[PDB]
Amino acid sequence: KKISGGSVVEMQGDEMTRIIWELIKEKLIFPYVELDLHSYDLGIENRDATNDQVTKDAAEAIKKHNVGVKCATITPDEKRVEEFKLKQMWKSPNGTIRNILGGTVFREAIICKNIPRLVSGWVKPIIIGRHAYATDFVVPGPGKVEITYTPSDGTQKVTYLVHNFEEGGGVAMGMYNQDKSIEDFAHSSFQMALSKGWPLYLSTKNTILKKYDGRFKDIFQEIYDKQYKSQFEAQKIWYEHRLIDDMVAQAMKSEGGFIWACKNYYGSLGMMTSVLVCPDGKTVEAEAAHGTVTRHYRMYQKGQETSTNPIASIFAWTRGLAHRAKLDNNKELAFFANALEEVSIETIEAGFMTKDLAACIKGLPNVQRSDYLNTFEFMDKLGENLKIKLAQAKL
Amino acid sequence: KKISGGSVVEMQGDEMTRIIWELIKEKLIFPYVELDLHSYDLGIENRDATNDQVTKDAAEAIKKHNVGVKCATITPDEKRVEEFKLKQMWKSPNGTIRNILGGTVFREAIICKNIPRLVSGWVKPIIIGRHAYTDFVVPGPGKVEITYTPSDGTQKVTYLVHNFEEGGGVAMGMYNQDKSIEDFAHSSFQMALSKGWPLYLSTKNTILKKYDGRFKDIFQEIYDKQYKSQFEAQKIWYEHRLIDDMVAQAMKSEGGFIWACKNYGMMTSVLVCPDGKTVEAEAAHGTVTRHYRMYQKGQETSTNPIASIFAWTRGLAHRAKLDNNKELAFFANALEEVSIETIEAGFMTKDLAACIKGLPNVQRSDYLNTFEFMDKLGENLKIKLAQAKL
Ligand SMILES: Cc1ccc2c(c1C)N(C(=O)Nc1ccc(C(C)(C)C)cc1)Cc1cccnc1N2
Ligand SMILES: Cc1ccc2c(c1C)N(C(=O)Nc1ccc(C(C)(C)C)cc1)Cc1cccnc1N2
Numbered sequence: 001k002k003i004s005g006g007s008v009v010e011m012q013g014d015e016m017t018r019i020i021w022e023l024i025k026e027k028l029i030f031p032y033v034e035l036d037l038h039s040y041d042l043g044i045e046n047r048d049a050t051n052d053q054v055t056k057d058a059a060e061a062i063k064k065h066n067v068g069v070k071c072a073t074i075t076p077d078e079k080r081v082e083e084f085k086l087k088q089m090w091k092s093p094n095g096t097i098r099n100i101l102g103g104t105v106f107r108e109a110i111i112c113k114n115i116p117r118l119v120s121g122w123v124k125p126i127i128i129g130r131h132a133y134a135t136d137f138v139v140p141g142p143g144k145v146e147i148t149y150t151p152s153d154g155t156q157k158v159t160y161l162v163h164n165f166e167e168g169g170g171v172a173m174g175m176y177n178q179d180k181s182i183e184d185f186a187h188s189s190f191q192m193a194l195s196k197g198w199p200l201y202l203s204t205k206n207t208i209l210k211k212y213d214g215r216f217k218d219i220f221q222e223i224y225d226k227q228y229k230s231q232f233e234a235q236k237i238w239y240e241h242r243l244i245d246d247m248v249a250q251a252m253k254s255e256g257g258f259i260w261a262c263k264n265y266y267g268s269l270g271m272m273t274s275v276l277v278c279p280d281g282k283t284v285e286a287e288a289a290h291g292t293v294t295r296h297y298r299m300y301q302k303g304q305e306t307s308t309n310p311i312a313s314i315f316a317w318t319r320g321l322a323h324r325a326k327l328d329n330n331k332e333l334a335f336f337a338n339a340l341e342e343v344s345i346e347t348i349e350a351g352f353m354t355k356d357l358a359a360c361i362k363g364l365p366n367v368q369r370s371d372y373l374n375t376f377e378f379m380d381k382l383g384e385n386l387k388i389k390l391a392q393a394k395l
Numbered sequence: 396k397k398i399s400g401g402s403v404v405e406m407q408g409d410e411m412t413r414i415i416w417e418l419i420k421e422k423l424i425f426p427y428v429e430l431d432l433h434s435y436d437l438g439i440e441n442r443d444a445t446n447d448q449v450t451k452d453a454a455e456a457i458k459k460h461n462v463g464v465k466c467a468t469i470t471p472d473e474k475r476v477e478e479f480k481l482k483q484m485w486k487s488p489n490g491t492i493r494n495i496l497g498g499t500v501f502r503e504a505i506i507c508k509n510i511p512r513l514v515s516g517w518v519k520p521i522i523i524g525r526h527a528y529t530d531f532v533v534p535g536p537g538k539v540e541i542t543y544t545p546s547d548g549t550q551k552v553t554y555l556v557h558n559f560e561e562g563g564g565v566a567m568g569m570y571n572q573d574k575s576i577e578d579f580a581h582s583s584f585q586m587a588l589s590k591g592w593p594l595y596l597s598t599k600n601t602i603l604k605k606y607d608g609r610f611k612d613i614f615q616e617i618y619d620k621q622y623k624s625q626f627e628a629q630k631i632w633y634e635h636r637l638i639d640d641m642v643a644q645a646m647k648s649e650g651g652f653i654w655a656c657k658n659y660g661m662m663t664s665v666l667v668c669p670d671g672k673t674v675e676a677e678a679a680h681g682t683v684t685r686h687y688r689m690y691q692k693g694q695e696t697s698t699n700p701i702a703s704i705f706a707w708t709r710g711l712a713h714r715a716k717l718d719n720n721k722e723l724a725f726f727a728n729a730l731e732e733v734s735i736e737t738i739e740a741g742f743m744t745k746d747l748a749a750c751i752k753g754l755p756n757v758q759r760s761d762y763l764n765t766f767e768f769m770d771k772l773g774e775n776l777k778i779k780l781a782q783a784k785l
Contacts, residue, residue: 170572
């Protein structure tokens with residue numbers, strides 16, 4: 001009576017994250033869900049052996065099957081090349097995948113009642129998305145710096161005067177943003193808001209950048225009114241623009257559970273996701289915000305006890321599986337993903353947590369061994385509680 | 396015999412912050428320290444009556460006496476204008492003072508062992524300072540470029556920012572003067588010397604080779620030419636790091652450093668002028684209108700005065716550093732210690748108790764109202780100064 005998941009692209013990672021990735025697969029995903037997996041080993045040894053071809057293949061597989069779950073991988077550096085005898089310093093796999101797929105990264109945090117957070121009034125999680133992919137020069141002495149735009153259809157050149165240096169030099173810069181990138185950011189933001197069922201809020205200081213940020217607001221409103229308005233009204237959700245100063249004041253006294261889309265001109269506690277949403281609203285790429293956890297991997301190699309938080313990695317699987325279920329209309333898979341998120345949260349709230357989580361409640365030095373469980377005990381408790389939850393749900 | 400403080404400019408605030416400001420003055424500062432006060436009422440009613448002239452006079456008094464402590468004030472808006480019948484919605488007093496004085500704002504956090512931290516490893520506070528200070532829509536395809544025509548007659552240098560392909564978009568041009576960077580560097584070094592902590596300049600110069608490379612160059616040359624000897628004498632160092640390398644080192648650190656970053660109730664905002672003599676301290680929180688309305692309704696209030704107390708201590712510490720006063724410097728540090736120890740001992744306000752016991756699991760016995768907390772602080776301060784006379 002296994003749940004038929006469907007086509008999901010999975011990628012193995014490195015060090016402690018690879019170990020916990022195998023643990024989540026063997027204990028939580030495989031015993032209940034049967035998938036048409038497209039496994040790709042993104043381990044530094046396999047990446048070196050295939051000349052980083054496996055990353056390009058995995059990215060192509062995601063573009064074809066729209067669902068991809070990724071484990072934490074190492075970005076090579078000088079010491080890493082010497083450590084693994086790497087042929088060359090390969091580029092970050094996340095960067096390659098992001099370049100091939102394209103889209104906006106939305107970071108969601110996992111909130112537990114007993115876990116202390118800033119504000120403390122935020123019961124529901126917050127999703128924040130920043131737009132992403134500049135020319136600079138040094139001004140030697142006094143002069144006049146100005147930006148010009150000559151249209152490639154005759155017309156007339158427009159000269160704006162950025163500044164007039166009278167005493168002393170300095171430095172000047174000039175950036176830009178294409179309309180297609182803003183349109184894609186707007187589409188990704190609206191599709192994320194529809195997938196999560198939460199209201200969207202665009203925050204920008206349009207008072208300072210009247211034409212720059214005013215354009216952002218105009219494109220967002222144009223797309224909202226032309227396609228997503230009816231869908232937003234049907235699900236009781238709404239889109240409202242707000243100023244950065246007004247937005248932070250509104251958010252601090254609000255409930256939570258809102259998609260915040262902010263303009264780009266970390267919290268690696270193991271409680272955050274990094275969902276890449278493509279503008280088409282069909283291709284997703286879920287991964288954990290934290291790194292490979294090398295510190296714990298060294299202890300694991302030495303045979304020492306480790307207490308690693310797998311919540312971010314589990315939530316990366318649940319988000320990918322929820323998106324797969326939403327695409328293929330799989331009620332059972334969607335329920336399974338929600339059940340796994342609930343078992344995770346409830347287990348932490350019940351008192352069973354790792355050392356990093358217990359360090360917040362009892363204090364980092366005051367953490368005793370009885371207060372927390374090591375990686376394997378926590379995963380075993382999660383599996384036990386998951387089995388119980390699914391057994392009780394067959395009613 | 397009270398400690399001889401000296402010339403300090405004090406600016407009265409509004410609402411709950413004004414109430415706690417009067418409480419700190421009458422209970423913690425005046426009974427032990429005798430000051431040459433230069434009081435200025437920055438109340439919305441006084442600001443309206445004088446046509447915001449009091450703000451300019453207070454800013455001038457700060458420039459003259461080099462030390463200023465400010466209480467939280469209201470920034471007018473539509474609702475405030477209607478409720479107070481204002482003549483005109485005045486500019487933010489902080490903006491006016493910042494324009495007259497200049498300088499860099501450094502935000503410092505107050506750390507207590509029992510209070511949960513954003514980073515578990517941070518035991519000592521970290522000070523963060525940011526550098527604070529033309530756009531247009533591109534209708535269709537074209538070529539946007541930035542030009543520079545020197546005033547000495549040399550040839551104009553043109554840099555292509557983007558040749559707009561199919562479809563337009565939007566563009567902008569930013570600038571920064573050398574004097575602003577020089578003043579930011581001086582303020583950062585003087586702050587690091589006053590706190591006795593190492594300074595770290597963090598920026599992403601890989602992308603901005605010329606822009607952020609200039610920042611690193613100016614900060615390297617003022618440090619090497621003037622502040623190197625003073626930094627070496629006090630065992631302090633200045634190291635420039637990339638933003639991605641800086642977050643990795645800072646995460647694995649106990650704190651206690653001055654972080655100067657260039658921008659692309661437990662916080663104190665200290666404005667440090669480039670001259671290293673003028674400092675304006677203030678609490679990094681609002682007027683607390685939510686508690687003032689309860690106060691007006693006769694309801695019990697539990698407001699945290701730690702940020703306001705720390706604004707006084709920082710101003711008094713800077714005054715002591717200028718006048719070479721050992722007694723006043725000790726008093727300011729003693730007041731910070733009594734504040735921290737009182738919170739750590741279990742005596743705290745409702746907002747602080749909400750972090751340790753959980754917001755919904757907070758009972759009356761766990762916290763004290765504004766007056767009880769101030770009385771406990773005063774009692775413990777008296778004890779601390781009595782024990783220190785050895
Ligand atoms: C990247 C990211 C994603 C999601 C979340 C966060 C972060 C950092 N966090 C957060 O407080 N965002 C935040 C909100 C406001 C600010 C201010 C102070 C600048 C106004 C700063 C950070 C963690 C947090 C905790 C509890 C509930 N939700 C969240 N969501
Ligand atoms: C404005 C400000 C100034 C100083 C401080 C803070 C804030 C908010 N705080 C803080 O957590 N800043 C912080 C800085 C960097 C990061 C990174 C690592 C994500 C880049 C995270 C938080 C409060 C805090 C608490 C304990 C000890 N020091 C501080 N200093």
